[model samples]
Target: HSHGLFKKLGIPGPTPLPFLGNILSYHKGFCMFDMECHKKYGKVWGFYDGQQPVLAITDPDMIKTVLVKECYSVFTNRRPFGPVGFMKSAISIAEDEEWKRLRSLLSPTFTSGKLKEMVPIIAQYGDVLVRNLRREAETGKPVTLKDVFGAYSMDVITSTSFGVNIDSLNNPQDPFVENTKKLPFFLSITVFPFLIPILEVLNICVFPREVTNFLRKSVKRMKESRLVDFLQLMIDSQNSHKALSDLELVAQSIIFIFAGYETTSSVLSFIMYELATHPDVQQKLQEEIDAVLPNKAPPTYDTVLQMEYLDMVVNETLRLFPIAMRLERVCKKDVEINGMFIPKGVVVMIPSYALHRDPKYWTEPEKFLPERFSKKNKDNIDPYIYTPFGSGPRNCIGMRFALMNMKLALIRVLQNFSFKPCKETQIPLKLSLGGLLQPEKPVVLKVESR
Candidate 1:
């Protein structure tokens, strides 16, 4: 029954085997499988997650058509969940009105004004990271930047979201750090497409009891402290009448930490790795940083925005290593595009990893040419195709906040030290298959005082 669904719709795709469908294709990894599909089948194709038909899309116009507000009424929910339970309250995974309500409540926390207020909070953690790195530099020890940036980002998210600085940088064994580390292991199970619905039915939770308790206690402490962090904002929103539930608040806080920590750290780690490999690019970026922030004074909101080269490098890094490698949506109503009928309940995927590297939209698609995003060439690239954070309103809400944190950390670190490739630095970098785009091996780099 599932075999001819796509054929009936005139969509091309890899052949699916009986009950397993195309699951074997992902034996290598989701990213590789999707890339292979696009290469073999074209921009629009179809495959099966068991018996369910899915549309794999990379065409820019169709992506824009599906993501924009006009089409959102139908494309309102993300992929259907099994039994997320309270975890469904997370803005990233929430659907329909709850999604809208949570988005509205959390949106203001990432605005320009709100992010500006949080700059000092980010800078405080940045200082701790730099202090730790400076010590390593003086001792001439090589560092695995993935861990280095991970610790710092965890600190930043904890402080910003829960209003407590557990200082994961200084205390790696902190309860928050230890428990949160265990989460991805559970999350890794969700990658098995067929298992998700079953897991939801079993009511299995992504967070263990201990992890949930830790975050709840952190929120409780934040409430008592009367700080205006994300937890406080949620509480206020709740008080403002019919807001998120207690468990929902905990879920959102955990999601904020998970979402912000991994992605920012991954992007930062990759950018540093790229800078380590490309000396000329590093030197040019440093020159730009120096010009705008000559005194090494703490970067203000306006000052960070003025650094064009910094933006270019970060944008290019995102293009190459988007955290959410794919954009997924489920069609809620029947829709047609260019003579193709997309029935309701069909899953639509925009392979951001493939789209980012497509030669049609990018020049020298594999090269690290930040100049592709230079002011002159910026308009040359299409918006729908270059989605690092993602496209449309449902895109990353923390985008501004993430950019602010990345820019601040980069400016702060570059002012103090330079990154160079060490013996452990993998030249081409082996990527991990399980999680977000991660280096299979540790991203080792030599830290040197400027």
Candidate 2:
């Protein structure tokens, strides 16, 4: 047998020992091989590090042949580090021809005409996060709207990636929002690369070098900002062909301040926990944000893209919280699906949290319907079951500027508020098992004025 790829993929492995293969059983937990070979080998399995055999991919038509037909000739360069290592060539850890020259030089800042020229600077940072929760509901006091929507997605990604008007909702403890709330412990060292070769063979430094020296002096004060942000439109494009340095522009501005302010503050904290546990799907999305803005401004990103139930409540809170919940690829050349053989560099995964709760491709796959993304039931589902932000040519290159900055900050906080669920949130939330897909506790809401 051609060196037994786990007895030719019958699968159930854990005994390889060459160059320390199965790298000492990966320090033990961090999704412990996705809960022991996907809850004990039900979804394709194999493991080894000493003599090297690693295969744990969860197949979805071989994850669309490893993210759209051989994503630039095989995978796994892992530009920075994942599991929480936020220092990759941003655009979610680039690779394959430096992720096609920085995704064709940041695909014209996620066009739709540059997100319709930043939708009035992202609804003026959602009108300073609903005027700081209407000044904490005029001092009735309860306000943790996920720390005021994480300082309105860190003052709209620090003025769209370093224009720097970090009036992070009137300076909610800025030192860049206290070093961007320690970017999910620096992306939990890219979900533990065996603690980056045991903190580099004990020399040790998995981030916290003063948060990579304050993001290398905020990418040298955003390249001497005379005026101009958005990383000086690729450092003032003097006929630039994706030119980058000054430590690759401070590692793509610490991945645009950690994936553009924690995936638009976890899609406005799961659209205020699905409008506080579906108050008749928040009174049918507050009658389409009070029939398209009665008075309280902030909707026009072309009327927040004709607010289709605020795009099915932010695509059903990005198909139930997909703050980059696992999608990996690595086999760049020789492919093949059901017959097996993945070859090239070998590492593939696509589990958009186990395919958005795979009831064989969702028909009440863990409910919260959001009219199954309406508009005549979004063509009765299954566009690769829904990705969150992944598909085709290296997905999520600022996916339409993080979906028009999470649908114009959830149509200006669901047209001035209604969510309730507080008792320090988390009734059945509990995610932060480690960096991203967060909300272990404190999504807390209680806002009112509708």
Candidate 3:
């Protein structure tokens, strides 16, 4: 019955098996698959990930319609990628009113004012990161930045979000670091999504059992910090409104604890890699940092925002390795938008990785050019094409919070140290096959104290 699905709709896509669909085609590597698909089939195409039918749309107007204009009415759910567990209450995957309530309650936590208050806390962790990097720099061996940034990011999240400074950089053997290290079971779902229902029936979950247990207990013990943090804000909400159950609150905190560090750490590592390889961009960015933050002074919220060139560099790095490679939403009902038909269960997939490097969209797309996002030129770029953070009301809620953390880390790290490409550095990075784009091997670079 579904064999004629794409043919009937007059959509172009890869052929699929009777039951498995096109899941085998991409395996764990969907970015390259989507890129290759767009290259051959233009923009609009269809493919199935397991039994789920997905429509990859790169048309700007269509993206706007689905993600913005009618997101609430039609495209509400963001294709539930989670198994039956604590993620049920997470804002990212929660459905309908639950999603709205969490979004409404948490929106206040990510405000510019709120984020500004957390700057001092982030800076404290930034200092630790700098000390750790400097210690590695003195060793005179190539430093593995992924490990360095991962630990730094862990401390930042634990201190600012949970109000408990684990200082994962120093205590690698700590349960916090040890538990977080085992969180890559997400890719397993890509292979047998059909087994999700079975897992639910059997009372199994995707996350490591021990890791989940450890985090669940830890979230309960999180205390109020004198300085404002995400968990503190949620705790206040729980006390004031009785809006969420303890389980739901714990679920939300767990989401932040894992998500807050994972993506930001990856970006921080990539930013360093790009800077090391592109000396010209690095020097320009360094100059911008020096101009704004002089004499190795600590960075504040206002000053980091003033570094316009650093903004462009972060933008370009995200463009190349979009934090979320695939953004999708399932139709609540059979709907026709523009001139295409989508069934009730069909998933609208936006392959941002492919869109970023499309020849038609960007000139010299493969090259690293921060100036492309300069204030003067940024307007020329299509907002729909560069969907790094996504758009509209349902876009990334922690966008501002994550930005402050990253900029502070970069500003502090680069203020005292510079990254240099080493013999072991992979010229063009080899990425891991998973939901997020990560370096397959350790991102080894020489660290120098300026």
Candidate 4:
């Protein structure tokens, strides 16, 4: 039935099995499996999740058509997931008008001026981050960038979102930090994704009970305080408009922690790895940082924003390793793109990993050359082909905030130390197969004082 549906529509793909579809063959990893499909079937291909026909597209023009304002109603929502405990209220997964309300209410909190207020919090934790890395550097043992950055990211997120200082860098096993670490692994396990709807009917919660309880406790405490943070903003919104329920209020906080914590750490880790391996790039980045902030003074928001090289390095890192490998948007109404008719209710996916690495769009696609994003070339590049944070309205809401955190952290690190490739570092990094694009092994790097 699925094969017939694709044939009727003139879309090509790997032969899927009876009930399993492509799920059985796609065991390597999400990114790897998607790339394999792109290689075999060309730019646009068809695949199935169980019996559902999903079109995987890497065509830039079609991507713009699906994401931009013209097709808002047709592609307004993300693919639906069964109610997943506290994750249900997250803005990333909210659909239709609820997403609009949540996005509108929360968007003000992430503006540049508001993000500027949060920089001091980031810089404060950045000092603690430096102290921790210095300790690791003195030991002369290869340090895992993910864990170090994970803890530091958690600290920054908790401080900015919850208005609490977790001090996770010093106390790695604190309940908050431990819980945050466990979530990605829990989410990656795809044993019964199709059963998720049934699981929701059964009222089965896949997330850990302890984690939810901790958040619930924390939310009650946050409600009692008059802190100036994201949580407080949500509280004020709730009080003023009664727009959010208790569940939603709790859910958005969890969303902030997850979104801000995981992607930032993973991106920073990849950036450090690229810088460590490419000495010339590292040297150039250091020179830029030194010239901009001589005297090792705390980086002002404006100064960090002005650092063109830092922006290029970060943009290049995201191009190589986007947070999510595949972006899924479901068609709400019939739409035609490039003579291909996509019926309503069919799934459409943008293979970010494939598009980012396509040779036609990028020169030396596999190589880590940050110069492609330099001012001379940046403007000439097509925005649709290079979407690290995604394109259009539903793109990452916390982009500015995430970049600020990364810039401040990088500024502090590059000012005090240099990163080098270590013995345990993977030459060509292998990634884990899951929801996120992450390293299969610990990303070990050597640190030396500048």
| Whole-model Cα lDDT of every candidate shown, in order | 0.80, 0.67, 0.83, 0.80
Residues 1-450 of candidate 2 have per-residue lDDT tens digits of 123676665666566554455545545423434545565566676654333345665566666666776566565343334333435555556676776777677667566776677667767678877887888876655566667787888788877776666666566576766776677445344335456666655644544557768868866765666643466666664234546656666777677777777667767777777678778888887788778877766577777778788778778777877777666665556666666776654556665765676666667766778888888878866655588787878777777777777777767777777777767667777666553566767577677776
433 Cα displacement, candidate 3 (Å):
3.9
Using TM-score as the yardstick, the better of models 1 and 3 is: 3
| Residue-by-residue lDDT tens digits, candidate 1, 1-450 | 657888888889888888767866766677888778878888798988767678987767788887775355877778765456667778888888778888887777777787778888888888888987887889988998877788888888877886667767677587567877765443334345567777777867766657777777766655667645777667777664256777788888888877887888888999999998998888998888888888777787899999999999999988888778888888888888655689977888888888888876777888899999999999988888888777787988888888989888898998888889988789998678764588888789998998
TM-scores, in order shown?
0.94, 0.33, 0.95, 0.94
What are the runs in model 4 whose C-alpha is more than 4 Å off?
Answer: 172-175, 178-181, 184-194, 239-242
Candidate 1's clash total is 1
Per-residue error (Å), model 2, residue 76 = 3.9
lDDT of 4 by residue, 303-398 (tens): 999999999999998888987777778898888877689988888888888888888788898898888988898887888878878888898888
Q: For candidate 3, what is the TM-score?
A: 0.95
As a whole number from 0 to 100, the lDDT of residue 145 in candidate 3 is 83
Per-candidate clashes come to: 1, 26, 0, 0
Per-prediction CA RMSD (Å): 2.4, 19.0, 2.3, 2.4
In candidate 4, what residue range of length 10 has the lowest lDDT sum?
183-192
lDDT of 3 by residue, 296-383 (tens): 8889989988999999999999999997887888888888888888778888989899999888989999888998999999998999
**What's the distance in Å from true for residue 108, model 3?**
0.9
